Design a protein around this ligand. Structure first.
Ligand SMILES: [Zn+2]
Ligand SMILES: [Zn+2]
Ligand SMILES: [Zn+2]
Lengths: 596, 72, 186, 135, 187
RNA sequence: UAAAAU
RNA sequence: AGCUGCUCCCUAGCAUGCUACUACCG
RNA sequence: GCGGUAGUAGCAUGCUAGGGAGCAG
């Protein structure tokens, strides 16, 4: 049970059991972490407590090894050794470890609670191994916090799936979302017995709530539901394989003249094969995706794997691939999960096909020629190491836009992240240079392009295609019918009704919402299939509808707004109360009785 | 000196084994036959001929990242 | 053993008896110095022995745990250490014949079959690109494994026969580059 | 049908390098490496077992045998043996393969245990009047 | 080794000893209080050593009965297993023709070798080389042991399927070449 | 308060 | 995945034997 | 001051059991 010092990679057998994640520490490093922190309990091949029954002095600095065993100050044998001695702590290979100076920031990491960007701002700039450990303890703290939510029980049954529930008084109630699952226990006297997994969702009124179940069990009244926790595996792969070069392209083989529509990018195609990996920054989904598939085409015999974090993202990508590829294609995507449905084409598990698509967390453990991560502007270094561990290939390509939407990383609530610090490759792009770049829109109406380039961009884009049928009724925000703090505004649909009918052909559009529950209620007084701004970022549409909640910080987020409005091809419309943005948007707003 | 090439043959054959090469009877049989003959070979040069003849087999597949090991 | 507490008592009794037998005093006084020193040896060995046993347990535990560790250590790394030892022995062995093909393979000259030795017998190698060919394919004789092979049936990845004479740097950017060469020894 | 092979032995390098360093194995030396761990492919078991083709039905001369057997017997006068009771046998190393198909359960100790000191005696006294083929 | 009638006698004798020794009184005091470490501890030698062996012997008895229990458990398990093996083995053979040839015996005992020869339902043949194959199960059906067998499904050493077409004279040096042929009893 | 696991 | 035979090393346990000093009686 | 019965620790022998490894047929 030995290892390497998380700071010196020296041999040791210690773990600061007081620190959450139990990381290996060299001697000197351990001495310093313990001398400067409330962290005191050190674990070795055995725990370190006084073995005389009753003594619970667990501040290691007080303890003494006796004959073979450990002892307090009092119950110590006549002969012994003091453990915490001579600026070190006794452990295996004590006389070999080197020690170093990364202890300060180390304790800073181990002691923060991820509440202020500073501990982040350091999390993204420490050493790689340290970065790993940081991500580990971050996700662990997230999980532990998740436990803090309350418990739910049943109060009375209404239908097969209509029900009235009872919450814990004085406890945080988590939201109704497809990303939550509850183990159901009913108790006889005796017989606290699990009944199955059950998700939830708000019905048509309170507190009638729908639920999807694992089995057809009959419901009762002495039932209750616990949100099911989760574990977190430790990681060991670096975030970025050391960057390299070569003198000549290897591994991959171009064609000849096939598909000139992808012309200029061949230049990038060569240098991609010429490096170990590289990045590409591009405004929304323009050359992005387009270029990826083009390269894939370029080297035919090249086994290629696409992957991202957002399900809808990999879905839009796989359909764009279907648009041009032999089939001869699969998206080995989701086992017994897929609470939201996705791919419709091929298997989920053979790993024979050359062009395999999937989601990161559901990836196998396989090899390939190249691999193209996507939407790095949303992922965390955690996931990057995950993919570098599960997979192993020659040339990697990461793509995204540091002006898009990052990981929610809900835990932070004080300040804001500079995009530069979302994760490693984010820095890499923002720091030295994106190595390869693309600067033109092939997907969006020119007018919204003008608006955005006037905003978050520095007026640095161009494209084609202009009109029409665009507006920004600055319709005051009606009642925030917020079920949970997740926002809903029914009188916002109170004017969608006026475009639920006035719509001549705007009947096949997609609706987009800042919040999930206002999106669900849009599915209620239905107009069309809708989605969330996050679940966007991957597809374009001719018409798109947009209503907003209040001017809350989450709502008025410029980046969310940008990535939302940048999903349309010919028609668009967005409805905020809007004190300022409608001054920045360039359309033709109207008034409630003025809708043609 | 010849001891060197003999021990080398032994190590190499062990490697081939570790690579699950015995899942094809013809290949594994040729390999074992070569290795045996090496261990009984009593000249200096015929040894090398059979040696490279064998090593080719390892060269076949792509399980052993050659460049990495060639880090000297 | 020395610094033990009971050794203090044994030392006191021994020194007291030393002074007594030095003064050459009575016999009735040593009746203690015997019934007070025998006990010292008694109350003393019954503790030097007891720590001694633990002192052997410590050994016969450490000497076991060590090998138990390095055991599973060595059964973790075979398909890794083995290869590097192999290539170490290779480099030390030093035979131009080998080094040739080894470098060639670092490059790409992977043979798709066993190298034969019969004066007849066929050979199938792979070539990635032009210079490889130029550094190797010279006329119709092939120099591989420091041996001379007669070039007979070039074919590119489209599985179509290609004219040997056509192979040159100018028109080369038009060929299914993984070229499969076949030949025979001298 | 199944085929079994015989993997090659594993090499101990550092000791070999040591032995070299102190001047062994130089060309023309008296002693050199001649014993090794030969490997075997898949047609080994059967192609070996076939060697029983060298076994022939032979009728040995009977009259002289009837006397050579006497002489051989005389060679064994100074010993003694006979049946022994189950509780008196000695089995050094109780863990060897248990033949077929008992190797589908465990080694010998399992069997030498699950039987009484009479099961062995009953069985022994049972063979003294009946025949039991084996595998 | 704490709550004993000898321990209490020890404690009270020692208490009286401390009392009359701090008194430092008579020589009879010394006598009656040395008859304490000398008379009140013989019981404390016996019952504080004998009782230490009672535990040892009881616990070794417990562990040996544990080992015997686990032993006889394994016995039941293995005998169940072999009984199952027997009962499942026979459940693949009772064709009436076996019974028939049994009834043809003048006694009911027949040599083992001829049972599967005549009564098996499937034959497997192992072939080394091509010429040899030609001289036996060449074609799609053949005869053997006075019966008619039909070929179906043919595999190789690597246990991969192969069709009869590939089995030419000159394609043969392309196969794991001691083939297994499984044929069926044709009527 | 936004994604989302043999 | 065997039948033996010899040999070394480690460990436990039992009992003996012996030693002595500490306790009871002669 | 000796002899017999109780302790201690040590030593010697041996016997068993258990475990590791090697050689010969
Ligand atoms: Zn700590
Ligand atoms: Zn350290
Ligand atoms: Zn204590």
């Amino acid at each position: 049970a030995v290892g390497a010092c998380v700071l010196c990679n020296s041999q040791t057998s210690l773990r600061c059991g007081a620190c959450i994640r139990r990381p290996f520490l060299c001697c000197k490093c351990c001495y310093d972490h313990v001398i400067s922190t409330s962290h005191k309990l050190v674990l070795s091949v055995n725990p370190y407590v006084c073995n005389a029954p009753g003594c619970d002095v667990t501040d290691v600095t007080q303890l003494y090894l006796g004959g073979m065993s450990y002892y307090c100050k009092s119950h110590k044998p006549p002969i012994s050794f003091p453990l915490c001695a001579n600026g070190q702590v006794f452990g295996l290979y004590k006389n070999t470890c080197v020690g170093s100076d990364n202890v300060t920031d180390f304790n800073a990491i181990a002691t923060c609670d991820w509440t202020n960007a500073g501990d982040y701002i350091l999390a993204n700039t420490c050493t790689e191994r340290l970065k790993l450990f940081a991500a580990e303890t971050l996700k662990a703290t997230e999980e532990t916090f998740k436990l803090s939510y309350g418990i739910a029980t049943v109060r009375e049954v209404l239908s097969d799936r209509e029900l009235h529930l009872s919450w814990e008084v004085g406890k945080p109630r988590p939201p109704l979302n497809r990303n939550y699952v509850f183990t159901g226990y009913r108790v006889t006297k005796n017989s606290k017995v699990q009944i199955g997994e059950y998700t939830f969702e708000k019905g048509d009124y309170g507190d009638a709530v729908v639920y999807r179940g694992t089995t057809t069990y009959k419901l009762n009244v002495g039932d209750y539901f616990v949100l099911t926790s989760h574990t977190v595996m430790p990681l060991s792969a670096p975030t970025l394989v050391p960057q390299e070069h070569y003198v000549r392209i290897t591994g991959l083989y171009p064609t000849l003249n096939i598909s000139d529509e992808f012309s200029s990018n061949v230049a990038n195609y060569q240098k991609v094969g010429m490096q170990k990996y590289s990045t590409l920054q591009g405004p929304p989904g323009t050359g992005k995706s387009h270029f990826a598939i083009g390269l894939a085409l370029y080297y035919p015999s090249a086994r290629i794997v696409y992957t991202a974090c957002s399900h809808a993202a990999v879905d839009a990508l796989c359909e764009k691939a279907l648009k041009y590829l032999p089939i001869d294609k699969c998206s080995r995507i989701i086992p017994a999960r897929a609470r939201v449905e996705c791919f419709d084409k091929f298997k989920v598990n053979s790993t024979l096909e050359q062009y395999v698509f999937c989601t990161v967390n559901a990836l196998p453990e396989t090899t390939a020629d190249i691999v193209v991560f996507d939407e790095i502007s949303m992922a965390t270094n955690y996931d990057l190491s995950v993919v570098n561990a599960r997979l192993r290939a020659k040339h990697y390509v990461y793509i995204g836009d540091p002006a898009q939407l990052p990981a929610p990383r809900t835990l932070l609530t004080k300040g804001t992240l500079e995009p530069e610090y979302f994760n490693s490759v984010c820095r890499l792009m923002k720091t030295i240079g994106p190595d390869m770049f693309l600067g033109t829109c092939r997907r969006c109406p020119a007018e919204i392009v003008d608006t955005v380039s006037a905003l978050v961009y520095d007026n640095k884009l161009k494209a084609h295609k202009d009109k029409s049928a665009q507006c920004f009724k600055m319709f005051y925000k009606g009642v925030i019918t917020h079920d949970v703090s997740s926002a809903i505004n029914r009188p916002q649909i109170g004017v969608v009704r006026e475009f639920l009918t006035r719509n001549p052909a705007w009947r096949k559009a997609v609706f987009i919402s800042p919040y999930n529950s206002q999106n669900a209620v849009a599915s209620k007084i239905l107009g069309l299939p809708t989605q969330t701004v996050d679940s966007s970022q991957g597809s374009e549409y001719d018409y798109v509808i947009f209503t907003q909640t209040t001017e809350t910080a989450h709502s008025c987020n410029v980046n969310r707004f940008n990535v939302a409005i940048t999903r349309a091809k010919v028609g668009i419309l967005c409805i905020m109360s809007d004190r300022d943005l409608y001054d920045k948007l360039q359309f033709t707003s109207l008034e409630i009785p003025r809708r043609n | 000196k010849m001891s060197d090439v003999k021990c080398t043959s032994v190590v190499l054959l062990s490697v081939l084994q570790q690579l699950r090469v015995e899942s094809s009877s013809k290949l594994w049989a040729q390999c074992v036959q070569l290795h045996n003959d090496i261990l009984l070979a009593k000249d200096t040069t015929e040894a090398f001929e059979k040696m490279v003849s064998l090593l080719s087999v390892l060269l076949s597949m792509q399980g052993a990242v050659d460049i990495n090991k060639l880090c000297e | 053993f020395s610094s033990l507490p009971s050794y203090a008592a044994f030392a006191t009794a021994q020194e007291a008896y030393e002074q007594a037998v030095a003064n050459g005093d009575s016999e009735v006084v040593l009746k203690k110095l015997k019934k007070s020193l025998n006990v010292a040896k008694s109350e003393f060995d019954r503790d030097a022995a007891m720590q001694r046993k633990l002192e052997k347990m410590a050994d016969q535990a450490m000497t076991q745990m060590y090998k138990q560790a390095r055991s599973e250590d060595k059964r973790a790394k075979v398909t890794s250490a083995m290869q590097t030892m192999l290539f170490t022995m290779l480099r030390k062995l030093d035979n131009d014949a080998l080094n040739n093909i080894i470098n060639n393979a670092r490059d790409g000259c992977v043979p798709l079959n066993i190298i034969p030795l019969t004066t007849a017998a066929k050979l199938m190698v792979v070539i990635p690109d032009y210079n490889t060919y130029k550094n190797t394919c010279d006329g119709t004789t092939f120099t591989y494994a420091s041996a001379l092979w007669e070039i007979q049936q070039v074919v590119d990845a489209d599985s179509k026969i290609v004219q040997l004479s056509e192979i040159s740097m100018d028109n080369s950017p038009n060929l299914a580059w993984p070229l499969i060469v076949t030949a025979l020894r001298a | 049908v199944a085929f079994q092979t015989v993997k090659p032995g594993n090499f101990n390098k550092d000791f070999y390098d040591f032995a070299v360093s102190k001047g062994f194995f130089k060309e023309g030396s008296s002693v050199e490496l001649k014993h090794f761990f030969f490997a075997q492919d898949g047609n080994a078991a059967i192609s070996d077992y076939d060697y029983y083709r060298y076994n022939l039905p032979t009728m040995c001369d009977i009259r002289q045998l009837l006397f050579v057997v006497e002489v051989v017997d005389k060679y064994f006068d100074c010993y003694d043996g006979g049946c022994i009771n189950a509780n008196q046998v000695i089995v050094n190393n109780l863990d060897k393969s248990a033949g077929f198909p008992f190797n589908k359960w465990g080694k010998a100790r399992l069997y030498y245990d699950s039987m009484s000191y009479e099961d062995q005696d009953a069985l022994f006294a049972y063979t003294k009047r009946n025949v039991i083929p084996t595998i």
